[PDB]
Design a protein around this nucleic acid. Sequence first.
DNA 1: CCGACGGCGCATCAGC
DNA 2: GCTGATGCGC
DNA 3: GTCGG
Length: 326
Amino acid sequence: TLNGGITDMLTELANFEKNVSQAIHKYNAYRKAASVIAKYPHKIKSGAEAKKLPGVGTKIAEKIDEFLATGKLRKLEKIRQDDTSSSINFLTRVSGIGPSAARKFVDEGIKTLEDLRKNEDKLNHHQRIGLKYFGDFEKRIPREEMLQMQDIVLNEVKKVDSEYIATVCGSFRRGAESSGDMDVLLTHPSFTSESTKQPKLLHQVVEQLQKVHFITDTLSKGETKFMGVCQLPSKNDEKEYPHRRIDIRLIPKDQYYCGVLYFTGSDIFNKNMRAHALEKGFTINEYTIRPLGVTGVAGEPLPVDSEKDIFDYIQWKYREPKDRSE
DNA sequence: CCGACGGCGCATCAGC
DNA sequence: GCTGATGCGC
DNA sequence: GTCGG
Ligand SMILES: Nc1ccn([C@H]2C[C@H](O)[C@@H](COP(=O)(O)OP(=O)(O)OP(=O)(O)O)O2)c(=O)n1
Ligand SMILES: [Mg+2]
Ligand code: NA
Ligand code: NA
């Protein structure tokens, strides 16, 4: 909020390069600088002052100078005018529609919300649902609602099997007063890093959550991952609650610490961490942390009994979830 | 001053 | 059907 | 786009 201007701008360029140009790296490089500048405790009064921070080279330094002076960015103004580019940007705002399929829709004439509605037969299942709820999916979930969702997820999970453990990670675990979606990490003793004693472990909780009408729809669903839609029950005469996005990851009981580390994010944080890990000589995934051998090859999984053990290996002083919102 | 750039589950399509 | 590259997401 | 080899 201190440098809302500069951050917002760079966030926009990021979407452009990601959606239109299909430049994932330029996308990443643009948002990293968004985070560092957002973290920066001073109202930046110069593109030079900005270049100092990591992830902020000279291009972004020149843009920051322009923005500071004019109040706008010509490069961004022209992208807004360009009907094709600003037509893809909109399609990607639908879960299931990435940079490619969006560009493929422009090439077929499908460019607006009403075009997708009439050509629903052109969309795959995920895109179809992403469209159906598109309106709702733009609305952020307040903490109060997040809490009510926690009870239901946990209380239903317990009813299936008491040995289950569900952890609402994401922006929730980071103490955000508002979340984008609902990320739910799940563990059960029957599923560990070398032995699986029960085939339908995730199917059980999903099925249950559906039977209680909490899980309205199902985007994707594997045996360890689930993307879907849920919605808090409503009272009488009250307008229904917006349908919400709910991810449900099932990590092996013994790898929890690595799993929660990931599912807690933020993604920028995980990127900056796994990058640094790689520099320190380690590769951190949502499963384990391993050494990068002598030939670069990832060695055997190192022992972790807490989140801190991970920060320790890479020589990073521990940081609470409330401080991982980058 | 030229390129590399965190990691992975599901869904989907291609070649066999 | 199985293997792998590719979209798209978290 | 940035930044390190
Ligand atoms: N490419 C990515 C994207 C996300 N994540 C992490 C960051 C999050 O902790 C979690 C996914 O959660 P969300 O995508 O729902 O986003 P957040 O929960 O971080 O924020 P919010 O939902 O408030 O927008 O996985 C990651 O490691 N790599
Ligand atoms: Mg989330
Ligand atoms: Na810099
Ligand atoms: Na999308």
